[PDB]
């Protein structure tokens, strides 16, 4: 009966950061996959299953949007296959990949004066993630062999950095939001 | 992204506010980290996240800067703080480094004893002989040295190599070395190093013939 | 109790191919990220690679193909094999544990020097310098391929006055340096001076004595 | 890294007033941040402590009910809103974050970068801006005397922050009435009165009273 | 509530020389993991506090080498080992390991120099405060050496007393000197009144009292 409701996801107030990504399910429902690839407000756009044309031709089980945001220099991990610090220990999509990786500058919103330090990331762990888990612990990472008896210091690292959004950065470290649809009916095009 | 500090080189007396800058090309917010490196020694952590010291770090070093202007700050120079610094990007994989930038110890003019050395007889057996000048303790450091066998200014045989700084009064030394057979040693009897240099009221000569 | 000591670095022939260790204490290896930097003659400090924790690697475009890096967690040493060896690898190698942002390469290895030449080993001849109120003296190290050489004096029972100059490349390609002590016109007589060269790149030690 | 802390001034005795400290040059949402205030010459006191997201807070019995600590990380700012406010809570205010975030690190514990301070007064009020009038002037000095004023603070600077040096400003003291008043003077060279104009910028803010006097000789 | 005490709560120090304040408390703070809870903040002149040590001997992020706290259990200890002008503060003690916090009542370091006499000068009041009633006269002692001194206020030489006010400044960083004013309150009627007002200091570098006067 009605659109499915990517002005949720997109156009949305607030990005979570990419340690605690935000997914949303989507279903009974079936939208059109060609406003948002005839948007061209987007700098990615890049899909591993079929063409973008197709998949409004078609109708799948359920479909999720995850949506956090990265440093645009690091968009190229979110793809199967990849390897970094955000697909390993933040995020990371299998490599049997069906679905579109979508992504824009954020840099007049998440970026502050004086930088912006709500955007974490993972930066230690001990072992890379498996396909779609979300780590949210926050957990003194012990990189020594003495314990850590629970105090944060040498060898003893809280294990989330924030990007330090300013908006004077360069490009490749500035805030891009990212959305990636994955594919598994009650939507469709 | 590239780096790039300055002063290449520097030379300050102790008790000087010496400053270097980094500038980066991109702007990278607050992530820098600025190293030490001793001559012959692996470098060492001075300063991360742009002002951040570094436990055990004396706190008379200080970085300040964010987006592309970075500034490491020696506040009274030690005479053991001759080194090379180097500025380092954190947060971008190839770790961009910067060039290096040398900073040097001033100090008062120091004159060099000069002490010269004829070829040892052990050596002369083989054919070649190796006359060898030494100049100790001095600063500037500066100094010509001029090689005159029987009374000739030597060219194009004798070459010198200089020292580090020295960590504690900040002096340098430095040896020439004249190379030629054992037949033309001993073709002449006088080898004289005539070294001249700012500390000196006029030259000093130090000779010394065969036998 | 925190320290990376390195070592397997030397004279390798080109085209060849050599592999350094840095066995660390205190860190474990596998659980950070460990980088190998290297620094060539005169020159800045080049990334070469990194290890993550979760296994990742990543290597600088003048090394891809050639160089693999790894680690052998039950002996917490992390290794880097150096293979297909050009003239542009000669440096002093340096492996360190990369921290990221949370700190920077804080903990570094005492480097070890790798020589990538066509030319071969040759050991020092060391003739001495002796002297002729201040006296000077020392031994004079000559014709070595390739370097380092390390004196000492007295088996490091005499470090006063003892200056070492950095050696000097000669039109034959080996090279020569002199180290040289100052001591008081008295000790001449009484005292026996000693200068021991060791040259490890040929295990080649030498100890002579410096008599007037 | 910046703890910035707005708010303060008077209030009348059961009164209510809530003062709100912003940082930035950290993660905040991560770190535990607490409140300290301490009397005028009294030594510290410690009054709060809330935890990364809310959720957790502690405060001294001696404020139990009456303040309420919260932020909100969105924002990057920490709030504490104090009411039936008496005689002894008048101190200066002082934002803390504390140093660890791991546990054991306890979130009312060692505080690793301190705000600047806000002032606190709680008495039947009186809200005078001062009046200021010029102290006049080898070496030689210059001064401001800022008289009758209420609550606190006043703060004194010369030539809009070009003289730093020589500089004395004094503490505040309270006269007969309970109006404040206090000078700062300088101390220049002789010779430089004739060619630098010394101006003393007063401005007691809680009043809205900026008023800069030129100082100048009298023969 | 653990109550702490340090002592001395005035510890007089000449720079290059070591210091050492003690802090204990009311009941142990060792181990919630097997450190020692007890830290030490240092409050400069005007400022904010700052940390210096915490978990008992570990020196804050820029701390000086200098600084260094020692002791456990209840027995705890900061040393300074070279003192500098710059270090001129109160230094309080604080248990973080129970819910309130509680601190030392603090210890006044005060940095001991040569002694230094302070330059004498005085204010007449101005045009503007007589359009109002009232008469200020200033008198200032600059950058002194003790806190020691006392100003007197004679109006056509005789002696003041229950006008006088007085506010002294906190140890320099630099000089580590004092200056103090004092201020005569009169009555546009009661200045008008005199010829010549004039301020007497005394103190322990001046030989001879200086008084420095002027006359309406």
Redesign the interface.
């Given at each position: 009966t009605n659109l499915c409701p990517f002005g949720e996801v997109f156009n949305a107030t607030r990005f979570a950061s990419v340690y605690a990504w935000n997914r949303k399910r989507i279903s009974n429902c079936v939208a059109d996959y060609s406003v948002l690839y005839n948007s061209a407000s987007f700098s990615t756009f890049k899909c591993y299953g079929v063409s973008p044309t197709k998949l409004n031709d078609l109708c799948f089980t359920n479909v999720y949007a995850d949506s956090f945001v990265i440093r645009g220099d690091e968009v190229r991990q979110i793809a199967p296959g990849q390897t970094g610090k955000i697909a390993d220990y933040n995020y990371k999509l299998p490599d049997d990949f069906t679905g579109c990786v979508i992504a824009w500058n954020s840099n007049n919103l998440d970026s502050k004066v004086g930088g912006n330090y709500n955007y974490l990331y993972r930066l230690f762990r001990k072992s890379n993630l498996k396909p779609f888990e979300r780590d949210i612990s926050t957990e003194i990472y012990q990189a020594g062999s003495t314990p850590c008896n629970g105090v944060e210091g040498f060898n003893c690292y809280f294990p989330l950095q924030s990007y330090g959004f300013q908006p004077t950065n360069g490009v490749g470290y500035q805030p891009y939001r990212v959305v990636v649809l994955s594919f598994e009916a009650t939507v469709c095009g | 992204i590239q780096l790039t500090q300055s002063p290449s080189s520097l030379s300050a007396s102790v008790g000087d506010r010496v400053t270097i800058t980094c500038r980066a090309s991109q702007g990278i917010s607050s992530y820098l980290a600025w190293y030490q490196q001793k001559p012959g020694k692996a470098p060492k952590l001075l300063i991360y996240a742009a002002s951040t010291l570094q436990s055990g770090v004396p706190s008379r070093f200080s970085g300040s800067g964010s987006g592309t202007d970075f500034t490491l700050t020696i506040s009274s120079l030690q005479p053991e703080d001759f080194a090379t610094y180097y500025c380092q990007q954190l947060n971008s994989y190839p770790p961009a480094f910067g060039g290096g930038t040398k900073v040097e110890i001033k100090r008062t003019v120091a004159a060099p004893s000069v002490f010269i050395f004829p070829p040892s007889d052990e050596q002369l057996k083989s054919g070649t002989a190796s006359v060898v000048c030494l100049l100790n303790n001095f600063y500037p450091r500066e100094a010509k040295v001029q090689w005159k066998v029987d009374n000739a200014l030597q060219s194009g045989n004798s070459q010198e190599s200089v020292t580090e700084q020295d960590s504690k009064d900040s002096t340098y030394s430095l040896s020439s070395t004249l190379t030629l057979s054992k037949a033309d040693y001993e073709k002449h009897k006088v080898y004289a190093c005539e070294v001249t240099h700012q500390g000196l009221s006029s030259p000093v000569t130090k000779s010394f013939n065969r036998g | 109790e925190?320290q990376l000591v390195e070592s397997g670095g030397g004279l390798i022939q080109p085209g060849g191919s050599l592999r350094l260790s840095c066995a660390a204490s205190?860190?474990?290896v596998?659980?950070?990220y460990m980088?190998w930097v290297r620094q060539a003659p005169g020159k800045?400090?080049?990334?070469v690679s990194?290890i993550?924790?979760?296994?990742?690697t990543?290597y600088?475009?003048s090394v891809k193909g050639r160089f693999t890096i790894s680690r052998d967690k039950s002996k917490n040493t992390l290794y880097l094999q150096m293979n297909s060896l050009r003239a542009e690898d000669t440096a002093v190698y340096?492996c360190?544990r990369?921290?990221?942002?949370?700190?920077?390469?804080?903990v570094?290895?005492?480097?070890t020097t790798v020589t990538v030449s066509s030319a071969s080993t040759k050991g020092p001849?060391v003739?001495?310098?002796?002297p002729?109120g201040?006296?000077?003296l020392?031994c004079?190290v000559?014709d070595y391929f390739p370097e380092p050489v390390t004196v000492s004096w007295n088996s490091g029972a005499l470090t006063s006055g003892v200056?070492?100059?950095?050696?000097?490349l000669?039109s034959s390609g080996l090279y020569?340096?002199?180290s040289?002590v100052?001591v008081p016109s008295s000790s001449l007589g009484t005292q026996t001076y000693i200068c021991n060269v060791n040259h490890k790149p040929s295990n080649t030690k030498v100890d002579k004595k410096v008599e007037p």
């Amino acid at each position: 009966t009605n659109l499915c409701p990517f002005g949720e996801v997109f156009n949305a107030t607030r990005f979570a950061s990419v340690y605690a990504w935000n997914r949303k399910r989507i279903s009974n429902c079936v939208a059109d996959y060609s406003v948002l690839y005839n948007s061209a407000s987007f700098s990615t756009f890049k899909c591993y299953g079929v063409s973008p044309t197709k998949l409004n031709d078609l109708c799948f089980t359920n479909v999720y949007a995850d949506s956090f945001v990265i440093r645009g220099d690091e968009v190229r991990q979110i793809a199967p296959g990849q390897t970094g610090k955000i697909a390993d220990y933040n995020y990371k999509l299998p490599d049997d990949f069906t679905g579109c990786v979508i992504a824009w500058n954020s840099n007049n919103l998440d970026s502050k004066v004086g930088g912006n330090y709500n955007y974490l990331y993972r930066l230690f762990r001990k072992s890379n993630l498996k396909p779609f888990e979300r780590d949210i612990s926050t957990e003194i990472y012990q990189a020594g062999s003495t314990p850590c008896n629970g105090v944060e210091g040498f060898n003893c690292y809280f294990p989330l950095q924030s990007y330090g959004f300013q908006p004077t950065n360069g490009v490749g470290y500035q805030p891009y939001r990212v959305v990636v649809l994955s594919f598994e009916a009650t939507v469709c095009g | 992204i590239q780096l790039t500090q300055s002063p290449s080189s520097l030379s300050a007396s102790v008790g000087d506010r010496v400053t270097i800058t980094c500038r980066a090309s991109q702007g990278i917010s607050s992530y820098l980290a600025w190293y030490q490196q001793k001559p012959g020694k692996a470098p060492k952590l001075l300063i991360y996240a742009a002002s951040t010291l570094q436990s055990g770090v004396p706190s008379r070093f200080s970085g300040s800067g964010s987006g592309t202007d970075f500034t490491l700050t020696i506040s009274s120079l030690q005479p053991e703080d001759f080194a090379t610094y180097y500025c380092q990007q954190l947060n971008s994989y190839p770790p961009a480094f910067g060039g290096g930038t040398k900073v040097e110890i001033k100090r008062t003019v120091a004159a060099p004893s000069v002490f010269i050395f004829p070829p040892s007889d052990e050596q002369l057996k083989s054919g070649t002989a190796s006359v060898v000048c030494l100049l100790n303790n001095f600063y500037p450091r500066e100094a010509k040295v001029q090689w005159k066998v029987d009374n000739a200014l030597q060219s194009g045989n004798s070459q010198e190599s200089v020292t580090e700084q020295d960590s504690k009064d900040s002096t340098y030394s430095l040896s020439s070395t004249l190379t030629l057979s054992k037949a033309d040693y001993e073709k002449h009897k006088v080898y004289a190093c005539e070294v001249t240099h700012q500390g000196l009221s006029s030259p000093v000569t130090k000779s010394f013939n065969r036998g | 109790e925190v320290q990376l000591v390195e070592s397997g670095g030397g004279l390798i022939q080109p085209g060849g191919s050599l592999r350094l260790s840095c066995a660390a204490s205190g860190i474990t290896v596998s659980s950070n990220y460990m980088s190998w930097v290297r620094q060539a003659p005169g020159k800045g400090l080049e990334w070469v690679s990194v290890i993550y924790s979760g296994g990742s690697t990543d290597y600088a475009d003048s090394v891809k193909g050639r160089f693999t890096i790894s680690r052998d967690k039950s002996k917490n040493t992390l290794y880097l094999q150096m293979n297909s060896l050009r003239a542009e690898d000669t440096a002093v190698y340096y492996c360190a544990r990369d921290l990221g942002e949370a700190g920077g390469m804080d903990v570094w290895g005492q480097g070890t020097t790798v020589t990538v030449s066509s030319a071969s080993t040759k050991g020092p001849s060391v003739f001495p310098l002796a002297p002729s109120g201040t006296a000077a003296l020392g031994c004079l190290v000559k014709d070595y391929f390739p370097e380092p050489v390390t004196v000492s004096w007295n088996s490091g029972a005499l470090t006063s006055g003892v200056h070492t100059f950095p050696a000097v490349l000669q039109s034959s390609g080996l090279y020569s340096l002199s180290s040289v002590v100052t001591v008081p016109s008295s000790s001449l007589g009484t005292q026996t001076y000693i200068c021991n060269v060791n040259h490890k790149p040929s295990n080649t030690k030498v100890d002579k004595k410096v008599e007037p």
